């Protein structure tokens, strides 16, 4: 209604989180509010009151002079006092809005659920002529959730090495692709299933650019990944393929690359000439079959991949 209304707000957090519950005044008369008092109750086994910041509504250049609180956790209460301190009505509340912000930590062992903060005792509010004003009260409180809240969206997908290999060895060939979001410090590395997920990605509907990279691999660039919520760039049954054989990193697969494998030709696991990343298919030796993998994309440069 158009009458005066005191309202405890609401908020939510995980245990351990600090939260702010506002206390609002609605229906503040032309004449102004010059004074109020009331008690608010709560559950100290769930919320620990840090402090109570005076609201924007409190306009004394030193709000603490006009506005006061006492927290009594053993009594399970908070007393609120407002007495416009100018003594001339100069600091009366004259607008609807925030009267105070309760600041609380949700205790670490708090139950999930909704914890009520209720106006439990009421004194008075009065206008700038010091005439008491009928007030309407509305409770609130905190929703204690165990749902983890996030820094934003999840970009994820699947990457596959484009070449045959023995299942037993997939864990190795599939892990270790670094996907990074260009222009930022966000990246992720694939797991043994070729799956990556970058978390905490700020919304961006203009699109990001992804850069997939790995030793011995031809760097790939995915442009125009628009993020308006969690995004999946690729799916397991249809991964992003990665071409191997950029051994001398220059974004071309050519003689210089094949040359490096040949320098280790016929080496075996334990052999001195051996070099795991050069055993392309991780079968225990470096031989013509490795070189043939590289030949799959002989002459290729990064630009040669597809844009999508």
């Amino acid at each position: 209604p158009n009458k005066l209304t005191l309202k405890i707000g609401r908020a939510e957090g995980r245990p351990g989180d600090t939260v702010e519950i506002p206390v609002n005044l609605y229906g503040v008369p032309q004449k102004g509010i010059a004074s109020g008092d009331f008690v608010v109750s709560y559950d100290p086994n769930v919320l620990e009151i840090i402090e109570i910041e005076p609201g924007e509504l409190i306009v004394d250049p030193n709000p603490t002079k006009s506005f006061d609180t006492a927290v009594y956790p053993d009594r399970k209460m908070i007393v609120f006092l407002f007495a416009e301190d100018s003594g001339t009505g100069a600091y009366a509340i004259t607008e609807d809005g925030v009267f105070a912000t309760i600041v609380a930590k949700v205790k670490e062992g708090a139950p999930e659920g909704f914890s009520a903060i209720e106006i439990s005792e009421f004194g008075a509010f009065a206008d700038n002529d010091l005439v008491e004003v009928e007030t309407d009260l509305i409770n609130g409180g905190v929703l204690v959730t165990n749902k983890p809240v996030i820094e934003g969206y999840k970009v994820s997908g699947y990457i596959l090495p484009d070449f045959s290999f023995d299942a037993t060895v997939a864990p190795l060939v599939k892990a270790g692709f670094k996907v990074e979001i260009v222009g930022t410090e966000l990246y992720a590395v694939t797991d043994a299933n070729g799956y990556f997920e970058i978390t905490g990605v700020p919304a961006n509907a203009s699109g990001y650019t992804l850069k997939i990279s790995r030793a011995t691999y031809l760097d790939r660039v995915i442009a125009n990944v628009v993020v308006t919520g969690d995004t999946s760039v690729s799916t397991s049954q249809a991964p992003i393929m990665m071409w191997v054989g950029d051994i001398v990193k220059d974004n071309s697969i050519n003689l210089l690359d094949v040359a490096e494998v040949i320098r280790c030709f016929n080496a075996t696991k334990g052999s001195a000439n051996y070099v795991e990343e050069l055993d392309i298919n991780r079968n225990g030796a470096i031989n013509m079959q490795d070189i043939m993998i590289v030949h799959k994309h002989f002459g290729a440069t990064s630009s040669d991949y597809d844009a999508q």
Partner: protein, 68 residues
């Protein structure tokens, strides 16, 4: 009724604000003879910025009983 500065049978934030105004002499008079008496919360004869502080602190419940 120690503290009922406006003599309405309650002790609340309204008393404290009126009291602040009285002590400033921004309002000339408390509503009654009892009022003036109620206003002297430390029973010290004078009615001034000490009463204001005391009443202020009783309302916040930092002080259990008034007349002190």
């Amino acid at each position: 009724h120690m503290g009922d500065v406006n003599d309405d049978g309650k002790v609340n934030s309204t008393d404290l604000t009126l009291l602040k105004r009285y002590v400033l002499k921004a309002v000339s008079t408390l509503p009654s003879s009892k009022a003036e008496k109620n206003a002297d919360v430390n029973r010290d004869g004078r009615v001034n910025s000490s009463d204001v502080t005391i009443l202020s602190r009783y309302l916040i419940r930092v002080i259990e009983k008034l007349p002190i």
